[PDB]
Amino acid sequence: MCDRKAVIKNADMSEEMQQDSVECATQALEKYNIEKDIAAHIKKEFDKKYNPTWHCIVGRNFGSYVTHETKHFIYFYLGQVAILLFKSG
């Protein structure tokens, strides 16, 4: 297992499901090579798990400004992959 240490750069979220985000993004990154499909898998998994609706992005060189639901925002890093997932809508 490639130990991709996660450092979450912003969050309004509970810690348990923040680590759930870390683990799910780890599995998605290990499973898919397309950044679009990484976002696909993470977003579908979260919509299934904690009830829709979220929005997820993965990238390298990015900023983004967002209004989210409380306790429903995360932005972290795995490896070289910035990963964002918030709930709004």
The CB-of-35 to a copy of itself minimum distance in angstroms stands at 3
Going residue by residue from 36 to 75, which x/- string records binding to a copy of itself, judged by CB under 8 A?
xxxxx--xx--x----xxxxxxxxxxxxxxxx-x------
Distances from the Cα of 43 to the Cαs of 1, 25, 46, 50, in angstroms? 23, 10, 5, 11
Dihedral in degrees, nearest 10, Cα atoms 9, 14, 15, 21: -70
The CB-of-1 to a copy of itself minimum distance in angstroms stands at 23
Instruction: Spell out the residues 6+ positions from residue 61 whose beta carbon is closer than 8 angstroms to its own.
Output: none
Q: Is 10 in the site for a copy of itself (CB under 8 A)?
A: no
Residues that bind a copy of itself (CB under 8 A): 34-40, 43-44, 47, 52-67, 69, 86-89
